[PDB]
Paper text:
The entry of HIV-1 into host target cells is initiated by binding of the host receptor CD4 to the only viral protein on the surface of HIV-1, the envelope (Env) glycoprotein, a trimer of gp120-gp41 heterodimers. Entry into target cells is mediated by the HIV-1 envelope (Env) glycoprotein interacting with host receptor CD4, which triggers conformational changes allowing binding to a coreceptor and subsequent membrane fusion. Small molecule or peptide CD4-mimetic drugs mimic CD4’s Phe43 interaction with Env by inserting into the conserved Phe43 pocket on Env subunit gp120. Here, we present single-particle cryo-EM structures of CD4-mimetics BNM-III-170 and M48U1 bound to a BG505 native-like Env trimer plus the CD4-induced antibody 17b at 3.7 Å and 3.9 Å resolution, respectively.
Concurrent with the development of small molecule CD4m inhibitors, peptide CD4m inhibitors were developed using scorpion toxin scyllatoxin scaffolds in which the CDR2-like loop of CD4 containing Phe43 had been grafted. Unlike small-molecule CD4m compounds, which primarily insert directly into the Phe43 cavity with few external interactions, CD4m peptides contain a more extensive gp120 binding interface involving not only a synthetic Phe43-equivalent residue but also an equivalent to Arg59CD4, which forms a salt bridge with the highly-conserved Asp368gp120 and an exposed C-terminal β-strand that forms hydrogen bonds with the β15 strand of gp120 immediately adjacent to the Phe43 cavity opening. The density for M48U1 in the M48U1-BG505-17b complex was well ordered, allowing placement of its α-helix and two-stranded β-sheet into density along with the coordinates for gp120, gp41, and 17b. As also found for the BNM-III-170-BG505-17b complex, one protomer of the BG505 trimer showed weaker density for 17b, gp120, and M48U1. The cyclohexylmethoxy phenylalanine side chain at M48U1 position 23 occupies a structurally-equivalent position with respect to Phe43CD4. Whereas Phe43CD4 inserts only 8 Å into the gp120 cavity, the hydrophobic cyclohexylmethoxy phenylalanine inserts and extends ~11.5 Å from its Cα, reaching the base of the gp120 Phe43 cavity. Unlike BNM-III-170, all polar contacts between M48U1 and gp120 occur outside of the Phe43 cavity. The β−strand spanning residues Cys24M48U1 to Cys26M48U1 (equivalent to Leu44CD4 to Lys46CD4) forms hydrogen bonds with backbone atoms of residues Asp368gp120, Gly367gp120, and Gly366gp120. As classification results for M48U1-BG505-17b were similar, we also retained all particles without 3D classification for the final reconstruction at 3.9 Å resolution. The BNM-III-170-BG505-17b and M48U1-BG505-17b structures both showed similar inter-protomer measurements as sCD4-bound Envs for V1V2 displacement (74 Å ± 3.5 Å and 75 Å ± 2.8 Å, for the BNM-III-170 and M48U1 complexes, respectively) and V3 positioning (76 Å ± 4.6 Å and 77 Å ± 5.9 Å, respectively).
Residue numbers in the entry:
A (entry chain H), H (entry chain I), K (entry chain G): 1 to 27
B (entry chain C): 33 to 126, 196 to 300, 325 to 397, 412 to 458, 464 to 502
C (entry chain D): 514 to 546, 563 to 655
D (entry chain L): 1 to 109
E (entry chain M), L (entry chain K): 1 to 129
F (entry chain F): 518 to 546, 558 to 656
G (entry chain E): 34 to 125, 197 to 300, 326 to 397, 412 to 460, 464 to 499
I (entry chain B): 519 to 542, 561 to 659
């Protein structure tokens, strides 16, 4: 992956989000 | 004066695509949740294989566009979704979730090899070259009906129980200088790994031998120097953040889901006896077949052991010193790492040419 | 099974066309060739893939029946080779061109040629 | 259907003595059972779980055992305040369908 | 170590519905399962159903299906029970219950069944006076 | 394919013939459970008795035509003359108002006498 | 005009085979149908597949089919290996193998006839099949449709209803000597029970019989010019089996005389019937009679809807009569498999040019 | 069915006999 | 495939005529499965044991045909004897004996003698 | 002027050799040893067996050089080696001896043999010989074909076959050559001389063969011998000549023991131109027949054990003489016990491709 | 089998020996 | 029956091995199996291993595997022994024991387990002095 | 494993003698009690757990089956003060293990 949701959590750390597998990963 | 002639049995071929049948030697008398699925949807192996080397011929393979990879990544999704029954499975469609609840027994789970044969009227090519940088013509090919076994394993950030090259550590990538495409190292030797749970609480220490890791990690940093400016000192770093799945080295073993904090393996900086890892056994994971979360039963009583060979790994650049940070996550592109040397073609034994006849 | 004869046909690519033809003529001929319960579901799934190649074989021996010459391998008929199909000096073909790349040369005309090769049949007896 | 039956129906025993309790199951409940102590108008209390362990803040004079389809608990030295009701319920079947016992009466003699 | 103040006494009508509260406070919330059990006068306790906090996937007893529903909200930390189509006979004393389930938020879950922490019960009655 | 082999009737020889010509080449047209290990097999045997039972039929024809000189060829005609006493019809309208649909009923009892005569007549080239 | 030879023209030759069952049996219960149908036939074919046709005028004939006898031997075996009567008296000197003749369960099942390697089956999907004649629409299929083996007389029960009207099927018509077949579009539940002496009450839904034979008068008066009012008459007489409706139900053999169903004449709450069991029945499987065991003890109930009847006229000159009858066993399926025909592919035909 | 005995039976009702399959029917 | 032999024991001429003519209990559910497949494994082999031959004959000029004759002279060394007592009073079983250790020779000539009509047709 | 042609379809055989396959009707729930091996590597029998006669087709069989024998003499070995596990399996290689010794867990088991059918694979036939006078070598003037052979019983014995399938007309004599003093005679019986021997409820037993039959069934056979010798030179039957223990006895298996019935009382008769008993002792140290070596099994079981099966064959041996002749019994080469059951069969391959010289010219 | 040893024992009794089965017989 | 006579007592040092003899007379030799048993003072008996004289196949206890051998000789009617990797504890007395087995010379063998005929004993001492 | 009872029995003369040696599991019929006065060579008295050796007084007889066995003497004697050991020989391959013995005194 949920990209929009994947962005929301990496934003709380100061990084962008990017999809990479039903799997969310921070930039 | 010149007339058309026709020949049957002429060596021509063209690229195509079909539906291969997975062939492997099952047993059908066990109950392990791999041999069952193997004996219900496969074919007894070919006893004596068939191989024909060609000469004065070149062909251009392309590992990042193959089709076999897709059929494999669907077939073993079938395998899994039939084998491991989760006690409660969740999935959005979206978001309108939909739980489920069935039986949830405990089962054995050790993977076996699985070939990939091609139906009558087609063929599979190979690249016996040992310098293949992923793309471009391979001037040493050879035909075969079907290939060597491929133990289908899943694990993130470190390929395990795989096959390896034989001359030098190689580095293949989709498009370097794009910063958003994984790469695929591949060792020439297995850095073994003892990883197990004792007989107290749910916790496992993952022993890996030193002086065979750093010895087999020096070769890597040298190979990176070539494809780069042979300067600008590089380093190995921790994960970057996100979901728990990508920020560790998770996999399955004997039926449980280990999560080893491999933060103490990528920390060296390279200018021009034992190690242990604190694994856990979680019980609510993020599925990879689809989007959603699973949940299984608490772990089993006795001792659990499984040893494997780290025969490759996934990295990611960071857009100077250019340290590297093991990531990965996606599970599709850890079968390219053992399926790049194959391409499927279609025979066409029928041609014409001009000559002089009746 | 019969499925090996196709790889046999393909084995000798990358060569000159004359040796290709000779090797064809000889090699097509030289290439003639719960335990017992679990041979009750592994029979079918292993007896389909053998009566599926026999079919695909006949689906070829049919075509050569149409074009006058069936049973023979090196067949030649009486349609004039029009020069608009990528003409070239004859010895610039049978001496320096592998079969594969030669297919590329006319891989767009193979339906024009296949078509005409039919009417030349029923127009040979009358 | 898994069913639990009480035995005995009532146990009225004198203080300073030992009293025992049993619960009978219909089929295999291997290692899933608990025992609760119900007071007059008060919330019950957890004493045993897993049929062989004890909770926090428990006097050791409580203990249970058994397997198969029968499980037994005994109390060795009653006190003037340990007169209450007692239940047994199992949690073995999944999907969750957790049966509940019927109880047992206990009072001074 | 969480204290579960159940709802106050209630008196309702036949056929109606009801929504009961159980305020949890004392520790983190989503590490705890929950269960609602009821007791009729003189009669033993009656297991009604279970709810999981980290997944929100409840279940219910066979002979009580359809006309009952459990729900919790992780923001207000209350477990709402609802029961449909009441009667004058089924009115009894209901109980809120919970248990510690492990280090949930990091993907660990023990999935126990018994009930350790209890409230003080609730009074539910249907009458004509 | 016999829907096409017999679905071009009525129309004169042209339509059916020129359809079957290319139809020759146009011949081109799982939760595995341990329970049905005696349902699918005994059902799988049937199809595998169908496909094979046609390949046998085919080869049994292409051998028959082979003894009438021409084998493989769909519409063949060879070096033997055919009689005139065979219920002599007009030598002009034999291709418009004299067709299989009128032949078949007339010749529903004339097959064996025809299939006989022709193979007997081939032997002129067989003496040498 | 000379003779050419081709390969591929789609041409049939109606012919005959020895087809094979498809019986949805169960094999763990112990009755008679559901054990014969699992030792001498095959389970259903999971995903049967079908093909339609076009422009295909196909001339059937329902008194000249030959998928018949295949049922008329599977069923004689079904009878021979199931209801083994005590004194199987067979007039050749009526020798008889007298067997252990015990009580056994009973109920029938749906059976399916399928076509072997190298043939087809061609329906007649129209709903105006007068009995013969060019049927202009047909399918192709492997197996038959749903069919159950009812064996009775004067009343043909448990058959798929027709849809539009009650079409009538004659040898040709008006020979007064051929068992007419008729078929409803409407179901009327039947129910005869034995309460708790060898006798029972056979009972119909009454007042429904009234509006279902008010339906038929239209269709008779479709073959006939609406005039000279007609009616039903009683069974004229013969054997008792003829003038009765006899069958087996629950394992024992009913004889219910339903005279209370024909009392009317059509201008322009039930009935009890002497439904008497017996131990002396004349066999249909061949010529003879058998001798069974004394009737059962307790309660056995019958519910079996009639969806087809049999009439016959009278040679007189006026008025006309329609009395129940029939009886000839084969009729029970000529009303159930009248629309099916097994033809054999054959792709080779010559055509002069 | 036995046609003769069928005929022998029906006439005694005033009727002719004929077979109905394996059964005797009076006309 | 095994009943083709029905005419074995008849003499040569009758064999020619007849070859032209012939050119013109819960186990009872198992027991009819592992003895059904043991048939298809015989036919689907007879077909392939056939496609090879009709291809082989497609080398000595004559494919398809049954009684093929050609233009190779018959050497003296191959048991030259009275023709009349060869096609009258001998069964193939006996003839195959007397010609056994020469078969591979004749199978060579029939290719060479075919190469004439190969190259010499468009001469 | 005589040119060669090529026909296609001529009936021709060429004897060959392949790997046949079982056909035995097991039960899958019993747990003796035969009925649990035959259900592991064999297949249920043929439901509708098909046979076809031939006409005017002579054929040259031969018994002493067959090639189905080995294919059975290996299956039987692989049956025993998985069945009777000894306690000490002494196996000398010694090609001073390095005699190894393996020891295992050796329990007691049931042992009774069921008939085994050999069938032909996909692409070969099997030619019976329906005659009744086939001496053993030469043409058989009547020949059929069949897929699976008749019911063979995997029996093992010495000096006396057991449960032997019988002939029809007489008591014949099949010899390798005859008059060579070095080859085993083989006999057969038109009638079964039933034999009863058991140990009652001290490890010994008595073997009883109905008397006055042996005398009359040694009267039939004694005739056919003089059919090959000049109506004189009186013949008799003598004691064993002596040797290893297994030869100079009648040994077999029965229920799980290894009996030894001293058959010195049956061959003392001399022929010019109501019961009898044998002292059957059990042993526990045998020279295995599968190879060179010795075994050592358990001591016998407690209760009563009984075995009765009709005798249908003998094995004899001559003496170099010049008079008179004597036939002291013997045997031992366990191959002989099938050359008396597979004596009328053959496996061949069909090859349809015939040439012939006639008068043709092909253009 | 051991043919040598066969000839030893059989000679020790006054008779010739000959192999005849993993089996030893003195003729 | 037989008459067993063990050898004389021995005195040895660590590191070496040991060898004894138990001359069995009074019967045929190959008809008896034998077993060597030892005892340390003030302790219980200790079965070590059995040897079948006719098959020349021995056996050994689970806690002496590979460091001790037994052997006999039917040419001289004597039975030997040798234990290897000497220690200090091996100071003890050793006993010769046999049992009857039937006329095994014709291949009947009862395969008994116990011991009926014994010697007199053999004491050995292993230490520095 | 051989468990005996008692460790060392002390009984007055003229009385009976009843020892007990118990095993782990099924030793069906292979037990042997040995007699030895100290300073001698031990002796066989019982084999098969139900039979008497040669030259033995008839008061020497035991009983039992399964895993429970008891030697039974009804009358003590002057020469019955010695060691008594139990031995089993049931399992195969042969792995024979004794117990611990028992002494008798006044
Ligand atoms: C590592 O690879 C070697 C082959 O190079 C193989 O023999 C070994 O079993 C592998 N070890 C593990 C633990 O996978
Ligand atoms: C037969 O019984 C059913 C149920 O018992 C009843 O509904 C039905 O009306 C009955 N029919 C007749 C005709 O009595
Ligand atoms: C069997 O008969 C053949 C043919 O006459 C002969 O050659 C052979 O010697 C005979 N053998 C015996 C045992 O008599």
């Amino acid at each position: 992956x949920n990209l929009h949701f994947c962005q929301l959590r990496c934003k709380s750390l100061g990084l962008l989000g990017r999809c990479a597998x039903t799997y969310c990963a921070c930039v | 004066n010149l007339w058309v002639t026709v020949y049957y049995g002429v060596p021509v071929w063209k690229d195509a695509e079909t539906t291969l049948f997975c062939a492997s030697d099952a047993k059908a008398y066990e109950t392990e949740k791999h041999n069952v699925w193997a004996t219900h949807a496969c074919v007894p192996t070919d006893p004596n294989p068939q191989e024909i080397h060609l000469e004065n011929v070149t062909e251009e393979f392309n590992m990042w566009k193959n089709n076999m990879v897709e059929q494999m990544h669907t077939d073993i999704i079938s395998l899994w979704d039939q084998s491991l029954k989760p006690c409660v499975k969740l999935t959005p469609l979206c978001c309108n979730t939909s739980a489920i609840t069935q039986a949830c027994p405990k089962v054995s789970f050790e993977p076996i090899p699985i070939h990939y044969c091609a139906p009558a009227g087609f063929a599979i090519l190979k690249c016996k070259d040992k310098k293949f940088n992923g793309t471009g013509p391979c001037p040493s090919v050879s035909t075969v009906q079907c290939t060597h076994g491929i133990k289908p394993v899943v694990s993130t950030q470190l390929l395990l129980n795989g096959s390896l090259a034989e001359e030098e550590v190689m580095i293949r990538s989709e498009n370097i200088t794009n910063n958003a495409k994984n790469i695929l190292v591949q060792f020439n030797t297995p850095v073994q790994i003892n990883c197990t749970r004792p007989n107290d609480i749910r916790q496992a220490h993952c022993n890996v031998s030193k002086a065979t890791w750093n010895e087999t990690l020096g070769k890597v940093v040298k190979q990176l120097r070539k494809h780069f400016g042979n300067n600008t000192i590089i380093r190995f770093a921790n994960s970057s953040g996100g979901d728990l799945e990508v920020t560790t080295h998770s996999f399955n073993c004997g039926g449980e889901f280990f999560y080893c904090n491999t933060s103490g393996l990528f920390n060296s900086t390279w200018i021009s006896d034992s190690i242990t890892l604190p694994c856990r056994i979680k019980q609510i994971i993020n599925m990879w077949q689809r989007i959603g979360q699973a949940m299984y039963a608490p772990p089993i009583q006795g001792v659990i052991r499984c040893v494997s060979n780290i025969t490759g790994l996934i990295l990611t650049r960071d857009g100077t010193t250019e340290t590297f940070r093991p990531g990965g996550g996606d599970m599709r592109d850890n079968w390219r790492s053992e399926l790049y040397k194959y391409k499927v073609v279609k025979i066409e034994p029928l041609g014409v040419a001009p000559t002089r006849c009746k | 099974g019969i499925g090996a004869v196709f790889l046999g046909f393909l084995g000798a690519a990358g060569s000159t066309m004359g040796a290709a033809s000779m090797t064809l003529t000889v090699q097509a001929r030289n290439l003639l060739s719960q335990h017992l319960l679990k041979l009750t579901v592994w029979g079918i799934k292993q007896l389909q893939a053998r009566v599926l190649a026999v079919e695909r074989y006949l689906r070829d021996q049919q075509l050569l029946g149409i074009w006058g010459c069936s049973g023979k391998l090196i067949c030649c008929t009486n349609v004039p080779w029009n020069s608009s199909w990528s003409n070239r000096n004859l010895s610039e073909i049978w001496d320096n061109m592998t079969w594969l790349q030669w297919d590329k040369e006319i891989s767009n005309y193979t339906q024009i040629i296949y078509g005409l090769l039919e009417e030349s049949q029923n127009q040979q007896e009358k | 259907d898994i069913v639990m039956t009480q035995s005995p129906a009532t146990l009225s025993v004198s203080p300073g003595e030992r009293a025992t309790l049993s619960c009978r199951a219909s089929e295999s409940v291997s290692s899933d059972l608990a025992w609760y102590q119900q007071k007059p108008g008060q919330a019950p209390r957890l004493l045993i779980y897993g049929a062989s362990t004890r909770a926090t803040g428990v006097p050791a004079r409580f203990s249970g055992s058994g397997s198969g389809a029968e499980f037994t608990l005994t109390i060795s030295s009653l006190q003037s305040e340990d007169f209450a009701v007692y239940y047994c319920q199992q949690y073995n079947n999944w999907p969750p369908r957790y049966t509940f016992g019927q109880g047992t009466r206990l009072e001074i003699k | 170590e969480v204290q579960l103040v159940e709802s106050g006494a209630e008196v309702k009508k036949p056929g109606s519905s009801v929504k009961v509260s159980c305020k949890a406070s004392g520790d983190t919330f989503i590490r705890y399962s929950f269960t609602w059990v009821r007791q009729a006068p003189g009669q033993g306790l009656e297991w009604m159903g279970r709810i999981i906090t980290i997944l929100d996937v409840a279940h219910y007893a066979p002979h009580l299906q359809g006309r009952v529903t459990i729900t919790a909200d992780k923001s207000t930390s209350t477990v709402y029970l609802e029961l449909r189509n009441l009667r004058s006979d089924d009115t009894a004393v209901y109980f809120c219950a919970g248990v510690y389930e492990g280090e949930a938020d990091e993907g660990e879950y023990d999935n126990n069944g018994f009930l350790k922490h209890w409230g003080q019960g609730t009074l539910v009655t249907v009458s004509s006076a």
